[PDB]
Amino acid sequence: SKVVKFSYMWTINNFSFCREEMGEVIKSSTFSSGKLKWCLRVNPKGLDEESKDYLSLYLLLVSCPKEVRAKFKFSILNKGEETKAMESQRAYRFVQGKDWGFKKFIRRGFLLDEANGLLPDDKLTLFCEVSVVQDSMVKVPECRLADELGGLWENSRFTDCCLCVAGQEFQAHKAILAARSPVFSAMFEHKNRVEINDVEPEVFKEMMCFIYTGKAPNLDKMADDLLAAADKYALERLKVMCEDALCSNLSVENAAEILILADLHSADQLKTQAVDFINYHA
Template identity: 30%
Template sequence: MDRIGVRNEALKHSSSPPPLAPPVTCSTSCTETVNGCHEFKISGYSLAKGMGIGKYVASDSFVVGGYTWAIYFYPDGKSVEDHAGYVSVFIALASEGTDVRALFELTLLDQSERQRHKVHSHFLRMLDGGPYTLKYRGSMWGYKRFYKRSLLEGSDYLKDDCLIIKCRVGVVKTNTEGPKTYNIAEPPSNIGQHFGKLLESGKLTDVSFKVDEEVFAAHKVVLAARSPVFKAQLFGPLKDKNTDFIIVEDIEAPAFKVLLHFIYWDSLPDLQELVGLLNSSWASTVMAQHLLAAADRYALERLKLMCEAKLCENVAINNVATTLALAEQHQCEQLRAVCLKFIAVPENLRAVIETEGFNYLRESCPSVITELLRYVASSGDHSFVTSGYGKGNFLDGTDGNGRRVKARLY
């Protein structure tokens, strides 16, 4: 019985859970430099020379990493042993501080077009011995023999009796961070929604635009903040006489409505949904074309790039010619390249020439036709240019004698 009791007791102890491991904590030490630069211009070098050994010209003080610094230039050298013919340059700690660790760089600027600057850098050698430590106020880092005086006075570093010395200071800072005791998710910005709701509400508007037969109300300050063209039109010295009611020409009402939507919401609506389901792909491409022209007119670069990207995605036989003309007129280089590459494919070229858009392209941008010929020729397939199209007819619609001919396919 005793043995069983002991065994049960042992089993009782063996089945108890193991002791909990001690909690693990963590922290991170981050050591980095706080950098700053100062440019010291020494005008009248010849007058400073001869002031005496150990005497210096000081720059104005500047602050880097919470400490004040200054550049000391010794035209006759800092000490007697270096008076043999060198100028001395030092960076000095000009504020209170003990054991300030920092990296330094001194650059004598070449004032010629060659820009061959003389650089003494502690940054490039920091792995050799680590940062330099300045013990107290007045401690300095620099070079007693910074540059030989005779060479300096005959070099491009000295121009119009002027020297320029640039210094860089990197103060070493160490920060230890413990684990975060919070987890707050930062919500995305919704400023566009606020401005969009303002446009939809129609409240506080102070300008109206008449486009075709539709009138759109808006807010001058919002338009001016988003578009430099609207800013000049509404507030500039050459602003419209009537800045409360403006008639807009050469833009269709649906495109202007989308333009306002972008200005307020900073995004585009679904163009296919906007134009309806019937032939929506073609209609949304036409909308993107009109919108790109409007974006260029009002200097909305982001909107212009968004339209350019959408048009690149939707290049097709029935729209590539008008899209290429648009790219040429509004300096959309990537869209232009995509269109040229698409048209240069022989089977595409035959079909594109038969579209009404190609006639528009030929009349509005004749230089593009010449470039298209070069592009097709450089692609390595010359059969279409030489014989496949009208047996000697050219893409500009003329034959070899310059007579106008009707485009035909064979």
């Protein structure tokens, strides 16, 4: 017998702000205790009609090596103590994609009432304690796929085509570009020199970097240009990563300018946040 306990503290700012309607969920970020990734789930206004006036809180097992028994307890931190705790009588069985919790954890009326101090500064901070139970490991290195692939790009290795960015000549790989981008694909399928005249070389270097490693380390300093590049080459995740880089900078200074930028490259998430920002500041 072995028992592994581990906490998690989730903070949701402006609990009254979130638009989530009865039936929508806000999934927190994953977390382990040092092979399984967990995370919490919260339905600001209930799981369904029976619980429209309550908050539904569930512990969810996100990833795992193809079953785990766990007990859990939820509570809201007021000084930092525990209030309104609910916990399983026993350990429940979880599996990749399974969740367990309380459909009717706490009434919205109660939680939103200030005399309960459950939302100091309108900040709901949830607290989950998990106790995994097992009956009675090698050091695995971290995936280095994205790194070794970026090597192909940095040091030009085994290239097979040429991308011309406003005069500039870059060596790259038809296959990788194709698998990683619909626009590049359509090109190499309908022939080794591609003319690119809609992206500045500095931004292009960054954009390729994304295509080969899934990362984009200078993103925060050319988010507007990288948002338009990501848009013109169907790189949806890059596009969304530029979208929040711009969303977090959003201010009464560049809000009208970010909105425009969002309406042209059709940045869904960013357009919402900007409209919602400009209004709550009108």
